[PDB]
Design an enzyme around this catalytic site. Structure first.
Site, short mmCIF file in Angstrom:
data_model
loop_
_atom_site.label_atom_id
_atom_site.label_comp_id
_atom_site.label_asym_id
_atom_site.label_seq_id
_atom_site.Cartn_x
_atom_site.Cartn_y
_atom_site.Cartn_z
N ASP A 146 25.58 39.98 -23.51
CA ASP A 146 24.31 40.12 -22.82
C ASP A 146 23.14 40.01 -23.80
O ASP A 146 22.83 40.98 -24.50
CB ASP A 146 24.27 41.47 -22.12
CG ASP A 146 22.98 41.69 -21.37
OD1 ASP A 146 22.24 40.70 -21.20
OD2 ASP A 146 22.74 42.84 -20.93
N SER B 44 8.34 28.66 -22.07
CA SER B 44 8.60 27.33 -21.57
C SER B 44 7.30 26.59 -21.33
O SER B 44 6.28 27.18 -20.98
CB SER B 44 9.44 27.42 -20.29
OG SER B 44 9.55 26.17 -19.64
#
Length: 330
Positions: free
Chosen positions: A35, A199
């Site tokens: 994770d 992004s």
């Protein structure tokens, strides 16, 4: 040193991926959920409340000659999905894919929430976010990657998750045969303890790319892609009959639909998520309403590039002094 381990989907939807991890001496192999959105290595154990164990493999520290209680240490964690676990702490030898760390904090669960009990395929979590998020008190502990970093050939790990197929986590090297083209690297902020990056935009299907900064986290422990409501609405508007359902808890679409791809930007590069990766199947057995793999982050507080996005790429988690993330197509 290096390590290399295969990671396998737990079910036919790629809801999560499990990776075998050797703990203790002799080795006890548990299948952990790696994770990158958390920083605790915790396991089902001989200490877990018996009624909360249902088919998981447990770590029994009393059977490991290298286990040592970390005296006074406790841990307690709550995840973004409302699940939680807590317990005490041992140090022990932990190996992943041939890479061994001695003295790793292994957090032994005394209690786990129902979602963990109900998933017999996941024996615990191995956190790979920054150690500043580790929950052990009163002495915070380091992640497996942080402990291994100095020994690694290069201070990196890579996630190469498969679509309806196994993939690979590598430690200490970048397998140049595992991706196409080049890797585009992008800056990381560690201020919240995550692999947080920005992004450069998105496209829906064959549509034009929209240049816009989207701050979010690369999180292998989250199934879906959670993005701002504007972006998510633009995606689902291209699927006839798709709608957001408050009762289901997100966007659903007719199972008869063909989904468009979704592209996200990494610098000047582009990662394309095929439409099929966004199909999470019937909301309930036999239903013709299917659950979408791109959902709004509006209620979370952070955008999350979960497995839906990450499995479309070869992803480098560069843990150099100034961390960065790399993405390549594959």
């Amino acid at each position: 040193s290096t390590g290399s381990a295969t990671t396998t989907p737990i079910d036919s939807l790629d809801d999560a991926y499990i990776t075998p991890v050797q703990i203790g001496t002799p080795a006890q192999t548990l299948n952990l959920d790696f994770d990158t959105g958390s920083s605790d290595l915790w396991v089902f154990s001989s200490e877990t409340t018996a009624s909360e164990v249902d088919g998981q493999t447990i770590y029994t520290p009393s059977k490991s000659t290298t286990a040592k209680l970390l005296s006074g240490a406790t841990w307690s964690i709550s995840y973004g999905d409302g699940s939680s676990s807590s317990g005490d702490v041992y140090t022990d030898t932990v190996s992943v894919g041939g890479l061994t760390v001695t003295g790793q904090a292994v957090e032994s669960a005394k209690k786990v929430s129902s979602s963990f009990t109900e998933d017999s395929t996941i024996d615990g979590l191995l956190g790979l976010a920054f150690s500043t998020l580790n929950t052990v008190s009163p002495t915070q502990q380091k992640t497996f990657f942080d402990n291994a970093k100095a020994s690694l050939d290069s201070p990196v790990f890579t996630a190469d998750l498969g679509y309806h197929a196994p993939g690979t986590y590598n430690f200490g090297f970048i397998d140049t045969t595992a991706y196409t083209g080049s890797i585009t690297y992008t800056a990381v902020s560690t201020k919240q303890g995550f692999w947080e990056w920005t992004s450069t935009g998105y496209a829906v299907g064959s549509g034009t790319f929209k240049s816009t900064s989207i701050d979010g986290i690369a999180d292998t422990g989250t199934t879906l892609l959670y993005l701002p409501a504007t972006v998510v609405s633009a995606y689902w508007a291209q699927v006839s009959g798709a709608k957001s359902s408050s009762s289901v808890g997100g966007y659903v679409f007719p199972c008869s639909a063909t989904l468009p791809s979704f592209t996200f930007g990494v610098g000047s590069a582009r990662i394309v998520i095929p439409g099929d990766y966004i199909d999470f199947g019937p909301i309930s057995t036999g239903s013709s309403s299917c659950f979408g793999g791109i959902q709004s982050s509006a209620g979370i507080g952070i955008n999350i590039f979960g497995d839906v996005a990450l499995k479309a790429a070869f992803v480098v988690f560069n843990g150099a002094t100034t961390p960065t993330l790399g993405f390549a197509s594959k």
